[PDB]
Write an enzyme that holds these catalytic residues in place. Sequence first.
Site, short mmCIF file in Angstrom:
data_model
loop_
_atom_site.label_atom_id
_atom_site.label_comp_id
_atom_site.label_asym_id
_atom_site.label_seq_id
_atom_site.Cartn_x
_atom_site.Cartn_y
_atom_site.Cartn_z
CG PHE A 39 -1.69 -1.33 1.30
CD1 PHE A 39 -1.53 -2.11 2.45
CD2 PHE A 39 -2.47 -1.77 0.23
CE1 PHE A 39 -2.15 -3.34 2.51
CE2 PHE A 39 -3.09 -3.01 0.30
CZ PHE A 39 -2.93 -3.79 1.44
N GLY A 40 2.13 1.17 -0.18
CA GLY A 40 2.97 2.34 -0.24
C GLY A 40 4.48 2.10 -0.20
CE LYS A 57 4.29 -0.12 6.46
NZ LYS A 57 4.06 -1.20 7.38
CE1 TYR A 107 16.95 4.27 8.04
CE2 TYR A 107 18.81 5.46 9.04
CZ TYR A 107 18.27 4.70 8.00
OH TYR A 107 19.02 4.38 6.89
CB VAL A 108 16.09 -0.09 12.49
CG1 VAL A 108 16.97 -1.20 13.04
CG2 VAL A 108 15.03 0.25 13.52
N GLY A 111 19.32 -2.04 8.53
CA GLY A 111 18.60 -2.66 7.42
C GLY A 111 18.07 -4.05 7.74
CG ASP A 151 4.63 -11.14 6.78
OD1 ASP A 151 4.76 -12.16 6.11
OD2 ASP A 151 4.74 -10.04 6.25
CE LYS A 153 8.14 -10.84 4.17
NZ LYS A 153 7.28 -10.85 3.00
CG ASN A 156 8.43 -8.85 7.28
OD1 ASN A 156 8.75 -8.33 6.21
ND2 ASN A 156 7.27 -9.49 7.41
CG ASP A 169 7.27 -5.43 7.29
OD1 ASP A 169 8.47 -5.40 7.50
OD2 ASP A 169 6.77 -4.96 6.27
CB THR A 186 5.56 -14.71 3.38
OG1 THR A 186 5.18 -13.34 3.52
CG2 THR A 186 6.65 -14.88 2.31
#
Length: 335
Positions: A39-40, A57, A107-108, A111, A151, A153, A156, A169, A186
Amino acid sequence: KEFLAKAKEDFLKKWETPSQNTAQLDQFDRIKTLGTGSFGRVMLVKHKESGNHYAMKILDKQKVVKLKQIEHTLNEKRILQAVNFPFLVKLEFSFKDNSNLYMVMEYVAGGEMFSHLRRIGRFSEPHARFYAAQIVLTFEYLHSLDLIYRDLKPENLLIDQQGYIQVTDFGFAKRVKGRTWTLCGTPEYLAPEIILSKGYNKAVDWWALGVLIYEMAAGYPPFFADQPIQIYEKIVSGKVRFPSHFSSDLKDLLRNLLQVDLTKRFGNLKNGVNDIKNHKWFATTDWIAIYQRKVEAPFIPKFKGPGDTSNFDDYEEEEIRVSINEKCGKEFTEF
Ligand SMILES: O=C(N[C@@H]1CNCCC[C@H]1OC(=O)c1ccc(O)cc1)c1ccc(O)cc1
């Protein structure tokens, strides 16, 4: 525990009365796209008044109304302002414009774990155990609050400045006392009861813990194929083939985590989380020192000063369009 009781009271107060409209766009400087989604997108922003970097987000109201995912979007935001754990990305601000829904998260800079696992190949079993310990503890916290995450994985999972996991997420996360029914998640990570369209519970999260640990330590998922349908066929038979480098301990935890029969899977038994926490693959894990973040991380991301996006990909930089007309107000009034 006294802490799980404290976690319930703080979750509940916030869950009963959500923080709403705690910032607005023009308080933030737009810098770069960190990721995109259904959605974005998530963008590195800089708070003008403090100078702090956040990950904002941006979901377009029109597309989530259109793909019918309004309850999940509202769920994500309401769970996020209401939770508080050391291995979760903190939602600092939230607001909406005419066209959009905004969640500014911390902010992490390290990554996604995904990048690092693909770059390193496979993680050593101590390194995998370090990460899995954080998730077990995260999942104990979230399941106590009757939240199914749905979710897990490596995409995320973000790696922070200290090399500790930060779960993000929460788009499919849900408040479920009991079973729920949506075809969420997923493919590679879906438990057999989600695939078989059953009313599933918190144990789907524990199955997905087995998919993550096998993937972190093998460097690739237990159930893979080209078609989703063929991945599914592998998951419901659930017969796993282990890499030879996998220890006996790892193979045993993963057989109990990747247990197709839900009533026999770890995390869902009578002893619950303790069957995982007390497993000999976690024999050298000091569970409180992981929580207190007193364990030396086996990998610390090469971090510069704040605002370095080195650890994230390059995406097309599009314009953040906010309409003159207020779209989808009614649907998103609780946001
Ligand atoms: O949530 C983050 N990024 C995720 C990383 N997971 C895989 C890519 C999806 C991306 O989030 C999105 O870009 C996104 C997801 C769904 C959606 O509907 C819109 C955007 C995230 C959160 C905080 C950060 O500091 C940095 C990144």
